[PDB]
Amino acid sequence: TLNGGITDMLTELANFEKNVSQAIHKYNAYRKAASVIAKYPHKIKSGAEAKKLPGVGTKIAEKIDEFLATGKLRKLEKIRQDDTSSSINFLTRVSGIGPSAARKFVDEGIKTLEDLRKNEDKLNHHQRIGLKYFGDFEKRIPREEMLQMQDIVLNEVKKVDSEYIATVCGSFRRGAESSGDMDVLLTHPSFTSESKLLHQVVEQLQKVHFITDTLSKGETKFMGVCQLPSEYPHRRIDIRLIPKDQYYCGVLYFTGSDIFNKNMRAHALEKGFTINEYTIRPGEPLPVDSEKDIFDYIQWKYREPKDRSE
DNA sequence: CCGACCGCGCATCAGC
DNA sequence: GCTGATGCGC
DNA sequence: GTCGG
Numbered sequence: 409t410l411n412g413g414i415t416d417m418l419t420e421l422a423n424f425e426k427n428v429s430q431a432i433h434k435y436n437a438y439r440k441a442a443s444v445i446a447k448y449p450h451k452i453k454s455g456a457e458a459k460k461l462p463g464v465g466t467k468i469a470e471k472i473d474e475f476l477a478t479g480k481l482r483k484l485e486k487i488r489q490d491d492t493s494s495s496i497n498f499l500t501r502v503s504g505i506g507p508s509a510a511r512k513f514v515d516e517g518i519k520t521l522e523d524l525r526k527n528e529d530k531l532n533h534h535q536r537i538g539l540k541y542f543g544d545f546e547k548r549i550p551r552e553e554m555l556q557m558q559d560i561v562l563n564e565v566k567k568v569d570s571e572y573i574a575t576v577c578g579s580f581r582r583g584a585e586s587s588g589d590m591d592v593l594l595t596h597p598s599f600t601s602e603s604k605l606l607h608q609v610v611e612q613l614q615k616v617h618f619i620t621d622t623l624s625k626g627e628t629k630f631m632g633v634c635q636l637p638s639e640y641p642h643r644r645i646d647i648r649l650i651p652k653d654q655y656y657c658g659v660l661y662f663t664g665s666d667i668f669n670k671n672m673r674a675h676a677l678e679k680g681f682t683i684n685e686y687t688i689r690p691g692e693p694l695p696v697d698s699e700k701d702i703f704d705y706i707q708w709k710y711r712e713p714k715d716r717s718e
Numbered sequence: 719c720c721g722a723c724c725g726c727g728c729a730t731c732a733g734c
Numbered sequence: 735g736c737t738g739a740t741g742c743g744c
Numbered sequence: 745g746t747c748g749g
């Protein structure tokens with residue numbers, strides 16, 4: 409937490425711009441600043457020192473001056489005290505409720521966790537589940553449960569087909585000691601860039617009562633809720649089915665971080681390449697046989713999953 | 719000063 | 735009933 | 745909000 413005070417402040421600003429202002433690029437601006445400062449090896453003594461960093465500019469430096477000076481920020485205090493603002497900010501904590509629905513609930517006087525409970529009729533399936541597990545979803549997941557979870561999924565997959573390969577990605581693959589959720593990258597030989605595979609994995613995981621609820625489900629992505637058997641908290645899980653011959657782009661994507669992916673895909677465009685969770689193109693998909701192969705194509709040195717937490 | 723700022727899967731519902 | 739526009743989230 | 749064109 410070298411500069412935690414400042415990165416905490418910037419993260420709150422970001423959240424406000426996203427949820428309340430609905431200014432996604434300001435959100436991204438503040439998270440880049442926060443990200444860049446988070447990897448700064450020195451304790452920031454002024455805004456001027458901070459301003460030297462790319463992503464940090466005039467408006468942020470002045471804010472850092474005020475925070476190092478007054479120990480707080482006036483803009484934030486103002487925002488925390490505004491009813492509409494704080495209300496919207498709070499509702500977005502519910503899975504399925506974004507800036508638009510939050511704002512619209514608040515306009516009709518629905519601003520608390522209780523108000524949503526007495527208005528179930530006005531939530532879609534996804535929001536209801538977000539409300540139902542509101543508390544549980546804000547709880548972190550210890551790697552000890554992640555390992556357990558990893559084992560219940562990998563083995564339930566073998567039990568559908570031995571050629572299925574399930575790889576747990578996300579914060580877990582980065583080596584985090586706790587994770588927001590569980591992300592599973594799934595492949596199988598009968599599915600490539602050339603021509604009910606996920607349904608089968610979802611069904612099986614449902615029968616053994618690991619998957620308790622469904623938020624969204626298509627032919628390549630599943631988002632739902634899972635739970636270790638006996639009571640543990642309910643947890644978020646996402647499964648992504650990726651063409652076997654695109655494992656490495658997929659696993660690079662699904663490993664993150666979200667900020668790292670945005671950094672990498674941008675630097676990609678600099679060097680003349682476009683990256684998605686499937687291919688890296690110039691253009692036709694270039695040949696890839698490892699994650700590193702991707703870091704080569706774009707003249708950025710390789711970095712172990714543990715060193716991708718942007 | 720202006721304005722671009724990664725890439726994509728699934729669900730909902732206003733407006734026909 | 736249908737389907738883009740839009741929303742939400744990875 | 746930021747930075748590069």
Ligand SMILES: Nc1nc2c([nH]c(=O)n2[C@H]2C[C@H](O)[C@@H](COP(=O)(O)OP(=O)(O)OP(=O)(O)O)O2)c(=O)[nH]1
Pocket residue numbers: 577578579580586587588589590591661662663664665666669670724725744
């Ligand atoms: N291109 C792109 N990739 C993203 C974005 N957001 C995002 O999470 N990803 C990728 C990187 C993440 O590791 C992966 C899974 O998302 P996640 O919500 O489970 O986050 P996470 O595993 O890194 O962290 P955690 O909070 O669950 O512990 O999706 C985004 O906005 N753009």
Ligand SMILES: [Mn+2]
Pocket residue numbers: 577578579587588589590591
């Ligand atoms: Mn995750």
Ligand SMILES: [Mn+2]
Pocket residue numbers: 578589590591645646744
């Ligand atoms: Mn996830």
Ligand SMILES: [Mn+2]
Pocket residue numbers: none
């Ligand atoms: Mn401007």
Ligand SMILES: [Mn+2]
Pocket residue numbers: 737
């Ligand atoms: Mn459609």
Ligand SMILES: [Mn+2]
Pocket residue numbers: 666
């Ligand atoms: Mn996330």
Ligand code: NA
Pocket residue numbers: 458459460461462463464465
């Ligand atoms: Na700067």
Ligand code: NA
Pocket residue numbers: 499500501502503504505506
């Ligand atoms: Na939300």
